[PDB]
């Protein structure tokens, strides 16, 4: 309960009179109450690392012992709140202090202790019902979209002897008093869970449903699933926040720059979404974790664990969370400097030896689960990491030890950026290992797409092993089946994998229109191949350069598929246009032969 500072030495504090102190448990160092973490016991002393600036901490300062490690507050009031990497609400320290600064040792509640929430019990409990860890006993109308479900803590069970009457409550009163055998206890409306502990589940279901990202590339050739893990080495993350099939977004910037973090907090309360014809601010179904590089280095490493623990909490209600964890490589640079303070031996380029263990302890909390509780729920957490290598390599220990863990790699390069292509998709080092899990969704609902996806990845590959000779030799003595797979292959690279994100046709790409565009482009490839191979020996052998001059008006309708608006036009107004065009592609070849 009481320690004393025996000696500080930089951000590491040695405390005495700490006999029963646990590892990684929280302490309040100093007279200003700096939050710390016990990292090394030696007998009755306790080496503490301080989560704040240590200047002015004398010896003989009191060290309060709490009994609980670094943990977040879970409850109603989270959605819309701007937190820190140790969950300090930055939109309320700016009010209760009325300054531009974060003073040392602030103790602001992470959830507000003044807002009255409308409690609604689950109408199937009573005074004398049996309830165990995970059973929903309340519903809070947090805002219009989120039905905030109150849940029992895991490893807590018994019989209810007090349920709270439906009304309006704050997050401090005693809403639930169930009893275990002999001992009565009390539950509030907020719960507290340690950020390095996995929130428990019943079973981990396979991730078999596609995460609809709003784009044409990355959703046909390299698909992601609900419950999957990606890597992006803001137009891919802002697109998922408006249109995708996720009900809670969690944006976690670990060590991002100050002006690029003040950019996002300016932009998200202006964004809108389309729910039922009404427009709604997207800051009703997201919560950010703001963290810059001026912040404590101990609160930058913990921002990833706070972000996924917040992400796992809204999973258990039954929502499908999608967490974007921006700048994973900044998070590893927080692991490099903690390990240097401990005098830990580095393994690879100064990074600790456990860089892969900590990343697999974060990326493997994603996935579709069967949620712990009574009403048979099902939620999921998608994690979208973002490695920033030192100039686009797989040599650093952060980029290469992410690709040994994740399943999707949305591999981007810097050379393929000045084409004004936008995205900077590479499609040679980018993969997706959710092609075998999605062989049931594609074959049942879409039943045609896997052989077109097999061909369309091949046409863009045969172009590569031609293009080195097309540069050096230059199209002089070439076969005519290769001129198909350079002009049809060019038609893909400007009309299928080409985007521009502020336009009224290319901010959402629905998937039935996405397979509708490839249903014509592969058919034009195979009919150009079947023409050139059966008319290779008989009489009046043709090349490509007699077709593209003759069928110049066919190559305009096959190039004006990306410019049809998916938003103004009808749902069936776009497939018939792609089904009428096929008979302008089946009859058109029968005008040459």
């Amino acid at each position: 309960t009481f320690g004393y500072v025996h000696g500080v030495s930089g951000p590491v504090v040695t405390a005495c009179d700490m006999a029963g102190a646990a590892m990684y448990e929280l302490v309040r160092v100093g007279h200003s109450e700096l939050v710390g973490e016990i990292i090394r016991l030696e007998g009755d002393m306790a080496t503490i690392q301080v989560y704040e600036e240590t200047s002015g901490v004398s010896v003989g300062d009191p060290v309060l012992r709490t009994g609980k490690p670094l943990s977040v507050e879970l409850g109603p009031g989270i959605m819309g709140a701007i937190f820190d990497g140790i969950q300090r609400p930055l939109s309320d320290i700016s009010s209760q202090t009325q300054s531009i600064y974060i003073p040392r040792g602030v103790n602001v509640s992470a959830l507000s202790r003044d807002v009255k929430w409308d409690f609604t019990p689950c109408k199937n409990l009573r005074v004398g019902s049996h309830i165990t860890g995970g059973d929903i006993y309340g519903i809070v109308n947090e805002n219009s979209l989120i039905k905030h479900k109150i849940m029992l803590p895991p490893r807590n069970r018994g019989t209810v002897t007090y349920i709270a009457p439906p009304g309006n409550y704050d997050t401090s009163d005693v809403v639930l008093e169930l009893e275990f055998e002999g001992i009565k206890e009390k539950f509030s409306m907020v719960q507290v869970w340690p950020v390095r502990q996995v929130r428990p589940v019943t079973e981990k279901l396979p991730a078999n449903h596609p995460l609809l990202t709003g784009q044409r590339v990355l959703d046909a050739l390299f698909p992601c699933v609900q419950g999957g893990t990606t890597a992006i080495p803001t137009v891919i993350s802002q697109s998922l926040s408006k249109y995708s099939n996720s009900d809670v977004i969690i944006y976690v910037g670990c060590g991002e720059r100050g002006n690029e973090m003040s950019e996002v907090l300016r932009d998200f309360p202006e964004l809108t979404m389309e729910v039922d014809g009404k427009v709604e601010s997207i800051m009703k179904r997201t919560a950010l974790v703001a963290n810059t590089s001026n912040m404590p280095v101990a609160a930058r490493e913990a921002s990833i664990y706070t972000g996924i623990t917040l992400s796992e909490y809204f999973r258990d209600m039954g929502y499908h969370v999608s967490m974007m964890a921006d700048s994973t490589s900044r998070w590893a640079e927080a692991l490099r400097e903690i390990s240097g303070r401990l005098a830990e031996m580095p393994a690879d380029s100064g990074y600790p030896a456990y860089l892969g263990a900590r990343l697999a302890s974060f990326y493997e909390r994603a996935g579709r689960v069967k949620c712990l509780g009574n009403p048979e729920r099902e939620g999921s957490v998608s994690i979208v990491g973002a490695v920033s290598p030192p100039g686009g390599d797989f040599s650093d220990p952060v980029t290469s030890a992410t690709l040994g863990i994740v399943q999707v790699f949305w591999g981007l390069d810097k050379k393929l950026a000045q084409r004004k292509h936008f995205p900077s998709v590479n499609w040679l080092i980018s993969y997706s290992k959710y092609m075998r899990a999605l062989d049931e969704y594609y074959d049942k609902h879409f039943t045609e797409f896997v052989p077109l996806r097999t061909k369309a990845k091949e046409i863009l590959q045969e172009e590569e092993d031609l293009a080195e000779i097309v540069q050096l030799v230059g199209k002089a003595s070439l076969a005519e089946t290769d001129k198909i797979t350079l002009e049809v292959a060019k038609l893909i690279k400007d009309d299928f994998l080409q985007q521009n994100g502020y336009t009224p046709y290319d901010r959402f790409c629905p998937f039935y229109k996405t397979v509708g565009m490839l249903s014509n482009m592969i058919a034009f490839y195979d009919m150009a191949r079947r023409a050139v191979e059966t008319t290779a020996q008989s009489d009046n052998k043709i090349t490509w350069s007699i077709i593209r001059e003759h069928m110049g008006e066919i190559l305009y309708k096959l190039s004006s598929m990306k410019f049809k608006d998916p938003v103004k036009d009808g749902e069936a107004k776009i497939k018939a246009d792609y089904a009428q065009l096929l008979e302008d592609m089946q009859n058109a070849f029968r005008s040459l032969e």
């Binding site: 006999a19 029963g20 102190a21 646990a22 590892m23 990684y24 448990e25 090394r40 016991l41 030696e42 007998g43 009755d44 490690p69 981990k204 396979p206 991730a207 999957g228 401990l342 830990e344 031996m345 580095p346 393994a347 690879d348 030896a353 456990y354 892969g356 263990a357 697999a360 302890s361 990326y363 493997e364 996935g367 390599d393 797989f394 040599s395 290469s400 030890a401 690709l403 040994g404 863990i405 399943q407 790699f409 040679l428 080092i429 993969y431 290992k433 075998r436 899990a437 097999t454 990845k457 091949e458 590959q461 045969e462 031609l466 000779i469 030799v473 002089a476 003595s477 070439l478 076969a479």
Partner: protein, 459 residues
């Protein structure tokens, strides 16, 4: 045996990372297992790291997050880490520590074997003789694996080496013209490839051959180091005491060495070359050299390690030392995976250094030597014509360089291309291999001698 009761200390002198250091210990053994129980009740396990007089440094497996030096009880065992082996564990799925995860019961032991293992007497080895038939044509036709060979599969991240390993395990057997088993160790896997391995082998009907050790990525990095030693002590019971032929597949041995580098640096050791431990050559050798046939027993162990080369580097010390102890390589290639070929196995760099003893008459068939090096020459001469055709065009190639480009369109799509469920037996990877060698006349096949050209070409 060990009939004395066990001491349960609560004299913890400190915690420093994953190390718990006790004091006033009565005669502590080295590498002895302890069982820590936390204040709240969570039982964790750990292994003794260093003894010094009355001290003991214990490396807790599941971390030290919640251990205090006042109320933690650390019960010593007195015996080192051993496994229970049985023949009825063929058909189970264990994790890295050896506990079942297939809703199964605990394995009733026939023996308790020390998992570190003793080396084999080098006089008591026999040279590998017969063939292990995998079912993949690219490693049975031209890169054949003996009985007792150690041949690693070299690949990279993103490449489908994990489905090659699952297709070997479904179809591995003998070379038929009751004693075959497979011990599949999976180190450093994620969840979505752990339920690929757990689901593929159990509903493709051949779970009864395979004993699956699945060590996850989120599981402790010490439990990844005892995973290939649990799998090889099971294989050394099943083969050298039950006379089975065992195939030992170790998946992603570059993930063993990333957990060995992590366990070494958390033991407060100083790293060696490229950050890896200095004893990395004699640490893989304790795994790889648990193989081969033995004198006086009818079993064998053939190993197939699998590697992931970072940045396609070969001078990295995980492929450097694997190619230094093991005999050949397989070389899953990236330029074939982008062209949609399964399995994407490159032939030109791959090699089996004991392939000339696993083939022949009375082992596979008489022409398996002369077919394989003939398809190897025509695969190389075609791939020069494949690049040369782009330089000069099609109108400048003769009726010689068209036989090699028409063979090359059918060697990659019929010999290399297999599909994941098509078990080509080795008698059918030669008839595939002959009906590509009929695109050429008998005046062109230089690598085949004329006596077997008369017996196998005209059909």
């Amino acid at each position: 045996y060990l009939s004395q009761p066990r001491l349960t200390y609560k004299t913890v002198s400190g915690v420093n990372g994953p190390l718990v250091i006790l004091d006033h210990v009565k005669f502590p053994r080295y590498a002895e297992i302890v069982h820590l129980t936390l204040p709240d009740g969570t039982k964790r396990s750990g292994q003794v790291l260093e003894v010094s007089g009355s001290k003991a440094v214990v490396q807790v497996f599941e971390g030290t997050s919640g251990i205090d030096a006042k109320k933690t009880s650390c019960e010593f065992t007195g015996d080192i880490l051993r496994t229970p082996v049985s023949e009825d564990m063929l058909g189970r799925v264990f994790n890295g520590s050896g506990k079942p995860i297939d809703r199964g019961p605990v394995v009733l032991a026939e023996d308790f074997l020390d998992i570190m293992g003793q080396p084999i007497n080098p006089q008591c080895r026999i040279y590998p003789e017969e063939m292990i038939q995998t079912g993949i044509s690219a490693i049975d036709g031209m890169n054949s694996i003996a009985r007792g060979q150690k041949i690693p599969i070299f690949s990279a991240a993103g490449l489908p080496h994990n489905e090659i390993a699952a297709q070997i395990c479904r179809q591995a057997g003998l070379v038929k013209k009751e004693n075959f088993a497979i011990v599949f160790a999976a180190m450093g896997v994620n969840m979505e490839t752990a339920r690929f391995f757990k689901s593929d082998f159990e509903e493709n009907g051949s779970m009864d051959n395979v004993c699956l050790f699945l060590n996850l990525a989120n599981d402790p990095t010490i439990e990844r180091i005892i995973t290939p030693r649990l799998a090889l002590t099971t294989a050394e019971f099943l083969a050298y005491q039950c006379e089975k032929h065992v195939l030992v597949i170790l998946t992603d041995m570059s993930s063993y060495a990333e957990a060995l580098r992590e366990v070494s640096a958390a033991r407060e050791e100083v790293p060696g070359r490229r950050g890896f431990p200095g004893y990395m050559y004699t640490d893989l050798a304790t795994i790889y050299e648990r193989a081969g046939r033995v004198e006086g027993r009818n079993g064998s162990i053939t190993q197939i390690p699998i590697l992931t080369m970072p940045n396609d580097d070969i001078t990295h010390p995980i492929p450097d030392l694997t190619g230094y102890i093991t005999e050949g390589q397989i070389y899953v290639d990236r330029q074939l995976h982008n062209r949609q070929i399964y399995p994407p196995i490159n032939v030109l760099p791959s090699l089996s250094r004991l392939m000339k003893s696993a083939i022949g008459e009375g082992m596979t068939r008489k022409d398996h030597a002369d077919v394989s090096n003939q398809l190897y020459a025509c695969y190389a001469i075609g791939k020069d014509v494949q690049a040369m055709k782009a330089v000069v065009g099609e109108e400048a190639l003769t009726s010689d360089d068209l036989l090699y480009l028409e063979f090359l369109q059918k060697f990659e799509r019929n010999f290399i291309a297999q599909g994941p469920y098509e078990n080509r037996t080795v008698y059918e990877t030669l008839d595939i291999g002959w009906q590509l060698l009929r695109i050429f006349p008998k005046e062109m096949l230089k690598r085949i001698p004329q006596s077997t050209l008369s017996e196998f070409y005209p059909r």
